Design a protein around this nucleic acid. Structure first.
Ligand SMILES: [Mg+2]
Ligand SMILES: [Mg+2]
Ligand SMILES: [Mg+2]
Ligand SMILES: [Mg+2]
Ligand SMILES: [Mg+2]
Ligand SMILES: [Mg+2]
Ligand SMILES: [Mg+2]
Ligand SMILES: [Mg+2]
Ligand SMILES: [Mg+2]
Ligand SMILES: [Mg+2]
Ligand SMILES: [Mg+2]
Ligand SMILES: [Mg+2]
Ligand SMILES: [Mg+2]
Ligand SMILES: [Mg+2]
Ligand SMILES: [Mg+2]
Ligand SMILES: [Mg+2]
Ligand SMILES: [Mg+2]
Ligand SMILES: [Mg+2]
Ligand SMILES: [Mg+2]
Ligand SMILES: [Mg+2]
Ligand SMILES: [Mg+2]
Ligand SMILES: [Mg+2]
Ligand SMILES: [Mg+2]
Ligand SMILES: [Mg+2]
Lengths: 39, 116, 52
RNA sequence: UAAGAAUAUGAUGUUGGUUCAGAUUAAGCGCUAAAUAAGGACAUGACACAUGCGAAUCAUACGUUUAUUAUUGAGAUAAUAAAUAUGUGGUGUAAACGUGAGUAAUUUUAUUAGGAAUUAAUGAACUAUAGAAUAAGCUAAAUACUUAAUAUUAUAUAAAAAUAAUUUAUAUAAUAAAAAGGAUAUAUAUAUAUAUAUUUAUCUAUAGUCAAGCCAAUAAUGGUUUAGGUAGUAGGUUUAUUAAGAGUUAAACCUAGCCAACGAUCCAUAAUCGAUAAUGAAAGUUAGAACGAUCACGUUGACUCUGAAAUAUAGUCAAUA
RNA sequence: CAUAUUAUUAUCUUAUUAUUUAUAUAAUAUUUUUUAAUAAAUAUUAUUAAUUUAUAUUUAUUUAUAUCAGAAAUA
């Protein structure tokens, strides 16, 4: 019960951090190294 | 006196008040009979968060500050990291100014050809 | 036992000699002046810089 | 202070492995063996253990018990002799001894002329000085236990500088926390008290010794046919706890980090080291039995008390026998 | 396919211990209001002992968390 509550708190925290890692990887500039910016 | 090391800030801005400092020391490898550089990365406390990646800084021993932090920036020897950020910010406006200027010049030259 | 060559070929050890006076005394002006000297900065700096 | 040899090939040169000559052992085995001196001796089952020993001592802590003399009338009290530790007490067993299971580093080892949190109104047990050692209650009595009496840090003011803090001095605040008497002499007085002393004890404070706690840097086996690992995880901010830092442990909030092909994580294996032993020309390699150093454990696991320090060879609970 | 040991858990059970809520005509001390048997001097007045009462220190009771160890499952 208390172990389950703590486990789910930790699971939510870990999943939030993984999702934010992905979003940070997505929140980058991503300029084309060959052609540069579009215009 | 306290342990002091000289190193390059190789990772900043990813942890609150913590940077990563790469230090190198001279060691003798007897297996190859050579004086080598032994490299290591330290997690270092940065009160004020003044350091940036690429700065040459002197780190000094302190009390344990976390599980892995035992050193703090004691002095910024060379501050190339701050200069890089300054030029990054300045170039944004600097470029755009003449980018608009020369676009104006191009359009004016086009119009001059148009009315010939 | 070739390590003994590093210590005058003396095998075995003695307990390290204790110091009668465990801190520098006041009648030693060289150490007093050395500690009470300005502290260097830069590559061989000892301490925190002015603005840090 | 560095030596090679035999064996390929029809023969030659070369590559290449195999083996040998040397030293040695914590050695076993076969055959053999005189005396003495010295150094060692379960490497394997941290497997199970018959039996006997390895931690007692103090009677001058308090209580008991006798015998003679003296006074008092079954006893009482003195003096002198003794016996009593199957009664209450104190001190002593955190050491030493043995062992190498675990441990590959989350607290282990080694090194440094390393640190801070600037390690506590801590002495454990001897020095050197000082000052104390007061009442009840409880036990049969007490140096046994209770209760009560009395004896550095935080503030603020300045000073400086080894300075962006520390140190110094002062004034307050609370510190504010103890104890113990026995053995002999005598000296007073009225067996009773008392006053001195000589003894050995008790407590407190300062300093010194001896010592403890924590952290950093570097190093410490094999397997990536173990390649991704990690959610207290990496970091920040507080609170709790600690003498003391720190996701060390507990709670809350955040940020999204941290480690890793110069090998992470995982797995296996192993006590570690030397001015110790072996070997070699030496770099090194091997051992870690003996001598010494360090660690860990005392049938297995966790927790707790006391204590400066213990998950103690203690105690509690459980497991095994 | 069978036997064994080690580890883990959003699982179950759980000695012990430490925290943690809440409850006791629950106890032992101090504080009251009262009820009882003694004392003494001349209606008592004080003592010892029970009733009620409210602060500490314990035990019993439970609430919650963690925990040796088992069980189940997974490796
Ligand atoms: Mg921190
Ligand atoms: Mg042949
Ligand atoms: Mg040979
Ligand atoms: Mg002999
Ligand atoms: Mg053995
Ligand atoms: Mg052995
Ligand atoms: Mg006696
Ligand atoms: Mg006795
Ligand atoms: Mg021991
Ligand atoms: Mg030993
Ligand atoms: Mg071992
Ligand atoms: Mg008394
Ligand atoms: Mg006492
Ligand atoms: Mg951790
Ligand atoms: Mg903390
Ligand atoms: Mg937490
Ligand atoms: Mg590996
Ligand atoms: Mg082993
Ligand atoms: Mg080895
Ligand atoms: Mg040995
Ligand atoms: Mg031995
Ligand atoms: Mg032990
Ligand atoms: Mg045994
Ligand atoms: Mg054990």
């Amino acid at each position: 019960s208390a172990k389950a509550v703590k486990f789910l708190k930790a699971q939510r925290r870990k999943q939030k951090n993984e999702a934010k890692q992905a979003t940070l990887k997505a929140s980058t500039d991503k300029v084309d190294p060959v052609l540069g910016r579009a215009d | 006196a306290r342990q002091n090391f000289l190193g390059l800030v190789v990772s900043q801005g990813k942890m609150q008040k913590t940077v990563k400092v790469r230090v190198e020391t001279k060691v003798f490898n007897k297996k190859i009979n050579k004086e080598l550089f032994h490299r290591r990365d330290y997690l270092v406390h940065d009160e004020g968060e003044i350091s940036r990646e690429g700065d040459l800084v002197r780190i000094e021993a302190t009390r344990p500050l976390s599980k892995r932090k035992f050193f703090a920036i004691a002095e910024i020897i060379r501050n190339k990291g701050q200069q890089f950020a300054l030029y990054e910010s300045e170039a944004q406006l600097s470029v755009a100014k003449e980018e608009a200027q020369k676009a104006k010049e191009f359009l004016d030259k086009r119009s001059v050809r148009e009315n010939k | 036992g070739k390590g003994a060559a590093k210590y005058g070929f003396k095998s075995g050890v003695f307990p390290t000699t204790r110091s009668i006076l465990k801190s520098p005394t006041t009648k030693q002006t060289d150490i007093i002046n050395k500690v009470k000297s300005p502290k260097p900065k830069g590559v061989l700096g000892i301490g925190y810089a002015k603005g840090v």
